[PDB]
Design a protein around this nucleic acid. Structure first.
Lengths: 461, 78, 431, 100, 49, 146
RNA sequence: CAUUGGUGAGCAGCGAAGGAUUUGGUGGAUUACUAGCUAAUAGCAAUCUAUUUCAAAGAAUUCAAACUUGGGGGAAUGCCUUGUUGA
């Protein structure tokens, strides 16, 4: 499958795929590291600009992502990989044929967990090593200790202790000695997610039935049982600013915020990610700041801010609703048609099966836009048709653009599936134009074209 | 001057364009700090008298009589 | 950003520290009682001489102010300023002021109270620093001129921006502009914190609770069109009615009944939510004047919701709670009233729980059916459960007397449902 | 109190003055080798300084009628319209129509 | 990169001039707490000035 | 090791609010000259910004956008009259931001200072000369060639 | 009669559980994306201090500089330059 003419560059237009991403503190700033299939990307927090991608693609899909201060740890099919700056700095091989599913890193002890209930421990050879490389031991969870390993977490102020959460119970492992030191009582529900807390010895467990069980690991007893009606829980995080906010993210596209001080709700964000692609897969607060970064399978990554309270004196009671901020995204579907918007190889127009049309950029990956399907007002003074509950245009199957006379009128004609008119789009304004071109013989359009002068557009019934 | 139809919006402050701000004083030397810019030096005799940046224009174009080419005298040269 | 917008943030922070004599003139002229010229030319001790006489008069009225003589109205509380003390003690000064205003929100129609709060305005700058709790305390007296005085002194927070045209206005704020204030989504949550702090400190009275009901009912009525807005407004007024029902007073129970009726009439709810509305009403109901209002509220709450299983059997926990908190004779004498409100869905849901749980007192439903006039489908569901009662219970002759009424009026209905379950001729053999 | 005791957490003798993140955990200046139980107690207090302790972890513990029944139901219910019944009576003042 | 630094003469703050604006770091004991009203008044009205 | 984040918690709210952290991103490194009494502040943007700042209260006496590279500005006798230093000449302003004089001398002023009991404006810049100027009479008193 | 003038009453037509204006705030682009800080071949990011001092290096216009003056006329007191007493 090698070529002597072409060679792959990158995959333009992807942000996330649905794997739970990682974030890493780096001084004051933060980097949001996600993965797209056989590669992975690093996004800055304050601008959502792409910073680094993998120089060489992974042989298979990236299953688990974790990131320390500088070194991003990617976990594909059999091996975990320690990367810096996108460069493959070290490849750590797991001496088993099973697949790696979760990857925790704390201290000198890397913690790789395969799918067949085995936890690998990797030790730094030197105490001043920058990443673990030597192989310490192979912890095993049997069928009498619990179910499959849902997640690996390391709680704060535990000396060489690994917290393992199964589908039925929580275990602890003294990784220096490789010994179980504590087992939790059985949880009747199937635990789906885990997260540490700013309070000590506290881990938050979210189940498939909408229960947040908040397990104090010192006493071995739960504390707060937060109930969510019949929703699959996928994400859990805490706002570490100091205000007691728990963010729980359902897989049904909902994001629920709880005020743990007042034992009350705050806001239920609806449809921040689509249902069919997984919903809110991973959503976490930046550490100490009221900016929550959410991502899912819908190929998007949004940021939401908790504004400061309008009341000057009350504060904690009247809390502001979360408010949309920076977001980068792509099509939720594979893209059908692609054209080029200019001779400079700058902008690429892609119309997908997600009923949309994006103008990606090959030069700067943060320059991409979703071109607006907001109809212009009719010149006649008569109200246009269509539904009051607005939906997107049908899927575009043929496209044509002339770059000669741009910005003074419409320069894109797009042809949709099963529609009896083609639609105009202005590339400079990045907006659907004010003209539709009927075939006038009762026919769907199968081909469209422009003149090179740009004044004339041709429509094929 | 005229290379762009769309100027950037991070250059207008609440008063004055950022690149129109006379930044000759921050230089460490003397001869380029000296401003002899006349007020009406539109297409003058020097460039230190301009007080602006030069504007782009082409002013004389001829086809080559031999080799299917054409030369245009530009601000950038020829 | 720019420069001057950051300066207004500094100016709003330092609007209480006096820098020049002009700034002292424009801060000491804030006056609840005196005019502008008399306020500028009087000393702190002269205000405190009237203040000590004011709080001594208030300690005669209620002795809860005897604490505030030694913490806020001491002679040592003159030299100290809010803008010389650090952040760990200005929070203690804030809630001490908030504790005083809650204990003095009722006492405002008396000139001793206005003289007492005048020195708290001047010495502790409460017309700039904590303007919210001052304005919430006097909000029910908006017709009175002391609210027009308070608006002429105060600087408005961003949440009470609807009263921005009523500062220094010769006409008082009206009823329509108070609802436009309460229509804000965030302000309802802030009044919830004010009301929850009002109930917790056990100083809730008639006039502020009459006014709070008069605005809570209107804000549902003004939002009756937008169904999305009333969905957003459900967790506030139900949590208020949860806290108002938890109060042991004679006034908060009736005020919670007023909120719970009109909200459900303007918005049908899930059955389990209105089932929880029964148990919270039925829990701490002991006031004699509130027992009649509670029976009419449960009556109205049952006919609000519509659907299958609307008039089904109650849980046994709720039924025995209703049996203890309401005698069967008491609800019969309630039905004796010739006004006779619409209790149709509640009664047929009450007697199905009677036929299921106690299975002993069927003389009440003989008196219940003779008193009330019931609709068609509710009678069918009563007879169907009494037919099921005829199968399992060791049938006494009062069950035959109950079906004797059922064949005395609308005998086709009992005959039709007997054809649905069993044989028509088998009824006499089984009873 | 304690639901588990790590037997191999007392014999450990970590150094403290070798990394700048742990150099704020010393209390004297002539201590460098500190055993684990003192070290994990010191590191707990340093973590309490970095992240504070909010009041809900301590003040709340879940462990004939009731008064918090409305509060309990409002926590467990997220949609409040009686529309899942299909009540066979149309809601007044609003109409749900579809045009074909 | 700081440009200059100057103390408030009768309070205790140093004003450090950086590239992105102005900060005032608090110090305990820079300024003198007993100013002379016949030379320099922080609280000076118009007619006194 | 004591930091400004925990000083502000343990310091009274008068000087806590006086800890003014501005943010003027769009211009150069700002030069600060307080008045001789701590009541007014003067910023000198390296690109264009001079604001006759009233500091303890939030008022702003004069905002000026001077497109030449301003270097150093100072209040001279009160909070009213202040003098900035441009690319080539030293200007002198009032409380309203109006020009008062264009000083024909002080032909470079990188560092401009004032000493109050003589009404003496001093200037010495990239030129070697130090020029003494009297703001009370307008007579350039001395011109020292260093 | 034209109105190529304004103000109002309607109709034809356009017309999927509203539609027109007008406006505040925020976010993303408006040049082509290799991450924060520091004393930087490394460390920090929960810190650089009970490790940051010594040593080494480091001095010409032999004692150098307004290349930056609106013009005319002077310049008493100034200032500059060159000649005139005593260590």
């Amino acid at each position: 499958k090698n070529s002597k003419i072409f060679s792959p560059f990158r995959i333009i237009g992807n942000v996330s795929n649905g794997v739970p991403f990682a974030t890493g503190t780096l001084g004051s700033t933060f980097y949001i590291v996600t993965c797209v299939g056989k590669t992975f990307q690093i996004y800055d927090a304050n601008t959502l600009h792409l910073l680094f991608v993998s120089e060489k693609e992974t042989p298979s899909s990236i299953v688990a992502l974790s990131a320390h201060f500088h070194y991003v740890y990617a976990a594909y099919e059999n091996k975990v990989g320690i990367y810096k700056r996108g460069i493959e700095e070290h490849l750590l091989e797991l001496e088993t044929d099973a697949n790696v599913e979760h990857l925790c890193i704390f201290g000198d002890y890397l913690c790789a967990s395969t799918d067949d209930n085995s936890i690998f421990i990797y030790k730094k050879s030197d105490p001043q090593d920058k990443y673990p490389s030597e192989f310490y031991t192979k912890l095993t969870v049997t069928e009498i200790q619990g179910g499959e390993i849902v997640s690996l977490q390391h709680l704060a102020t535990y000396l060489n202790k690994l917290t393992v959460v199964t589908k039925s119970n929580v275990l602890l492992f003294n990784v220096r000695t490789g010994k179980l030191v504590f087992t939790s009582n059985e949880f009747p529900d199937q635990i789906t997610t885990a997260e540490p807390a700013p309070v000590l010895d506290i881990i938050a467990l979210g189940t498939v039935t909408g229960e947040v069980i908040m397990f104090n690991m010192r006493k071995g007893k739960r504390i707060r049982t937060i109930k969510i009606p019949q929703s699959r829980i996928s994400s859990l995080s805490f706002r570490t600013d100091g205000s007691s906010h728990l963010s729980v993210g359902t897989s049904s596209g909902d994001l629920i915020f709880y005020d743990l001080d007042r034992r009350s709700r705050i806001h239920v964000l609806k449809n921040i990610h689509r249902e069919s692609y997984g919903g809110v897969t991973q959503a976490t607060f930046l550490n100490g700041q009221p900016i929550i970064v959410t991502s899912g399978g819908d190929n998007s990554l949004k940021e939401y801010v908790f504004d400061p309270s309008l009341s000057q004196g009350s504060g904690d009671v009247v809390v502001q609703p979360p408010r949309y901020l920076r977001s980068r995204g792509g099509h939720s579907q594979p893209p059908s048609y692609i054209a080029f918007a200019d001779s400079q190889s700058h902008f690429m127009l892609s119309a997908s099966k997600d009923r949309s049309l994006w103008s990606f950029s090959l030069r700067k990956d943060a320059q991409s836009q979703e071109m607006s399907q907001r109809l212009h007002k009719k010149q006649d003074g008569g109200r246009v048709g269509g539904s009051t509950i607005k939906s997107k245009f049908p899927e575009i199957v043929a496209l044509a653009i002339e770059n000669a006379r741009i910005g003074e009128w419409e320069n894109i004609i797009t042809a949709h599936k099963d529609e009896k008119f083609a639609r105009t789009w202005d590339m400079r304004n990045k907006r659907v134009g004010r003209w539709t071109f009927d075939t006038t013989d009762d026919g769907f359009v199968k081909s469209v074209a422009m003149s090179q002068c740009g004044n004339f557009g041709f429509i094929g019934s | 001057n005229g290379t762009l139809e769309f100027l950037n919006s991070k250059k207008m402050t609440e008063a004055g364009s950022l690149d129109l701000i006379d930044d000759a004083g921050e230089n460490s030397d003397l001869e380029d700090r000296i401003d002899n810019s006349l007020p009406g030096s539109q297409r003058g005799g020097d460039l230190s008298t301009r007080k602006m940046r030069p504007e782009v224009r082409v002013t004389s174009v001829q086809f080559s009589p031999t080799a299917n080419a054409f030369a245009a005298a530009s601000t950038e040269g020829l | 950003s720019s420069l001057s917008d950051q300066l207004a943030q500094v100016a709003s922070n330092n609007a209480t520290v006096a820098l020049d004599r002009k700034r002292r003139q424009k801060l000491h002229s804030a006056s609840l009682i005196y005019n502008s010229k008399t306020a500028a030319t009087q000393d702190y001790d002269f205000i405190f001489e009237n203040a000590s006489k004011a709080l001594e008069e208030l300690s005669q009225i209620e002795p809860k102010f005897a604490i505030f003589s030694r913490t806020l109205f001491s002679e040592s509380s003159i030299s100290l300023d809010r803008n010389v003390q650090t952040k760990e003690e200005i929070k203690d000064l804030d809630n001490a002021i908030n504790a005083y205003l809650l204990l003095a929100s009722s006492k405002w129609y008396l000139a001793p109270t206005l003289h007492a709060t005048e020195w708290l305005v001047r010495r502790f700058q409460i017309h700039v620093k904590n303007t919210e709790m001052l304005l919430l305390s006097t909000l029910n007296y908006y017709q009175t001129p002391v609210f027009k005085r308070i608006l002429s002194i105060i600087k408005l927070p961003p949440l009470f921006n609807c009263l921005s045209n009523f500062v220094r206005s010769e006409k008082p704020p009206t009823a329509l502009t108070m609802i436009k204030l309460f229509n804000d989504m965030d302000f309802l949550k802030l009044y919830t914190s004010y009301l929850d702090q009002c109930i917790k400190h056990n100083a809730t009275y008639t006039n502020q609770l009459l006014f709070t009901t008069c605005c809570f009912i209107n804000v549902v009525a003004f939002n009756s069109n937008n169904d999305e807005k009333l969905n957003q407004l459900v967790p506030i007024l139900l949590e208020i009615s949860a806290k108002l029902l938890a109060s042991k007073s004679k006034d908060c129970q009736i005020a919670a009944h007023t909120i719970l009726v009109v909200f459900a009439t303007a918005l049908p709810l899930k059955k389990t939510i209105i089932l929880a509305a029964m148990e919270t009403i039925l829990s701490n109901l002991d006031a004699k004047e509130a027992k009649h209002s509670a029976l009419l509220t449960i009556c109205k709450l049952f006919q609000t919701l519509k659907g299958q299983g609307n008039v089904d059997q109650l849980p046994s926990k709720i039924f025995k709670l209703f049996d203890s908190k309401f005698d069967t004779v008491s609800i019969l004498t309630f039905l004796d009233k010739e006004d006779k409100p619409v209790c149709d869905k509640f009664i047929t849901s009450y007697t199905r729980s009677i036929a299921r749980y106690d299975r002993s007192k069927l003389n009440i439903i003989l008196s219940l059916l003779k008193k009330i006039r019931l609709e068609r489908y509710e009678v069918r569901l009563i007879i169907t459960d009494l037919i099921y009662l005829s199968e399992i219970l060791e049938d006494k002759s009062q069950l035959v007397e109950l079906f004797e009424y059922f064949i005395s009026i609308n005998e086709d209905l009992v005959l039709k449902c007997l054809k649905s379950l069993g044989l028509t001729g088998x009824x006499x053999x089984x009873x | 109190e304690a639901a588990w005791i790590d037997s191999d957490d007392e014999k450990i003798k970590v150094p403290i003055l070798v990394t700048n993140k742990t150099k704020k955990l010393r209390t004297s200046y002539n201590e460098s080798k500190i055993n684990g139980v003192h070290y994990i107690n010191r590191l707990r207090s340093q973590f309490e300084k970095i992240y504070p302790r909010p009041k809900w972890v301590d003040d709340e513990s879940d462990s004939n009628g009731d008064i918090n029944a409305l509060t309990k139901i409002l926590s467990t219910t997220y949609n409040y319209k009686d529309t899942l019944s299909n009540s066979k009576l149309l809601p007044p003042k609003k109409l749900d129509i579809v045009r074909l | 990169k700081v440009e200059n630094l100057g103390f408030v003469p009768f309070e205790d703050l140093l004003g450090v001039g950086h590239q992105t604006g102005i900060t005032n770091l608090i110090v305990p004991g820079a300024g003198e707490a007993n100013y002379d009203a016949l030379e320099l008044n922080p609280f000076e009205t118009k007619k006194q000035r | 090791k004591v930091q400004q984040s925990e000083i502000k918690s343990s310091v009274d709210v008068s000087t806590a609010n006086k800890a003014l952290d501005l943010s003027l991103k769009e211009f150069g490194p700002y030069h600060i000259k307080y008045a001789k009494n701590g009541t007014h502040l003067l910023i000198t943007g390296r690109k264009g910004h001079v604001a006759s700042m009233d500091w303890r209260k939030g008022q702003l006496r004069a905002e000026l956008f001077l497109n030449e590279t301003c270097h150093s500005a100072t209040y001279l006798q009160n909070e009213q009259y202040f003098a900035v230093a441009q690319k080539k000449y030293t200007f002198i302003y009032d409380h309203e931001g109006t020009e008062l004089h264009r000083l024909k001398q002080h032909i470079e002023a990188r560092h401009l200072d004032f000493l109050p009991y003589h009404y003496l404006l001093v200037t010495a810049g990239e030129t070697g000369w130090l020029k003494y100027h009297d703001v009370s009479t307008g007579q350039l008193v001395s011109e020292l060639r260093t």
